[PDB]
Design a protein that fits this description.
Ca(2+) 2 binds at residues 168, 170, 173. This protein is α/β, with parallel strands linked by helices. It has a single domain (1-274), classed as 3-Layer(aba) Sandwich (Rossmann fold), CATH 3.40.50.200. 30% of the residues lie in helices and 18% in strands. The protein has nine helices and nine strands. The protein has helices at 7-10, 13-18, 63-72, 103-115, 132-143, 219-236, 242-251, 259-262, 269-272; strands spanning 27-32, 44-49, 88-93, 120-123, 147-151, 174-179, 195-200, 204-208, 212-216. The structure holds calcium ion (CA) (2 copies). One calcium ion is lined by residues 126, 150-151, 165-168.
């Protein structure tokens, strides 16, 4: 049997899938710890590794496989169900099995995705610090028409401090915060002027190695909901620019409160894809 994780109806991705738009012919790169390509509920059609000695189609951490399943777990009678289950899914390994990687490897992965015609980049990753090379890579991807999505960070809030991580903080990247199954902001969700939209991030059930399923918490679970939503929109409206996809997501989001804490609110992909 197949389970529908709560995030799929919460963002109204089920409604868009029922219209017949499921991400077909949209290319999404998951820049992470790899993807377990042999998982029965995923179809990884290509990728690249920039982690020395690690293949992109294996995932010794689990994070990348989980993120990938939120985007793209196959619609069948097995496992779970992704936001955009017909996407062309690419594993871009930029983090090792311990979840860390050089920033130049992350840049190489962004560049690979751009050169190879990805429509959407998901970076469920980041840190407190950026770099000129990282900013240039995401800026170039967006300028060349890629929708770039990243986790806002899991640093929470403290007074008025801006805790958005990089690359989410760059203007070319959609910074995604996290809500739970009640649609309440998760306390770990980072905050600040760059926070753009919210998506399900607490208690997110997805694919996990080896051939299994697991529940994780983080803004890095919220980001792939937005990446998948972008792919749903593009599968219905293939001629849109990256900015047009991005604005559909933020202009139709459900208001949750002040943008510092919630951005424009919870994405509603049914409304965004109208
Ligand atoms: Ca499935
Ligand atoms: Ca980030």
């Amino acid at each position: 049997a197949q389970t529908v994780p709560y995030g799929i109806p919460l963002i109204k991705a089920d409604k868009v899938q029922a219209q017949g738009f499921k991400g077909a012919n949209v290319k999404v790169a998951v820049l992470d710890t790899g993807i377990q390509a042999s998982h029965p509920d995923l179809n990884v059609v290509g990728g690249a590794s920039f982690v020395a000695g690690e293949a992109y189609n294996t995932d010794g951490n689990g994070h990348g496989t989980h993120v990938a399943g939120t985007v793209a777990a196959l619609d069948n009678t097995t496992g779970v169900l992704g936001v955009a289950p017909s996407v062309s899914l690419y594993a871009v390994k930029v983090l090792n099995s311990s979840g860390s990687g050089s920033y130049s490897g992350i840049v190489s992965g962004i560049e690979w995705a751009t050169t190879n015609g990805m429509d959407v980049i998901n970076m469920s990753l980041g840190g407190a610090s950026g770099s000129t090379a990282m900013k240039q890579a995401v800026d170039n991807a967006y300028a060349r028409g890629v929708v770039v999505v990243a986790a806002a960070g899991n640093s929470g809030n403290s007074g008025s401090t801006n805790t958005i991580g990089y690359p989410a903080k760059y203007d070319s990247v959609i910074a995604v915060g996290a809500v739970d199954s009640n649609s309440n902001r998760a306390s770990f969700s980072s905050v600040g002027a760059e926070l753009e939209v919210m998506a399900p991030g607490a208690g997110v059930y997805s694919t996990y190695p080896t051939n299994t399923y697991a529940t994780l918490n983080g803004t890095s679970m919220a980001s792939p909901h937005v990446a998948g939503a972008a792919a749903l929109i593009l599968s219905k409206h293939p001629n849109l620019s990256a900015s047009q996809v991005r604005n559909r997501l933020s202009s139709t989001a459900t208001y949750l409160g002040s943008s510092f804490y919630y951005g424009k609110g919870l994405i509603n992909v049914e409304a965004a894809a109208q």
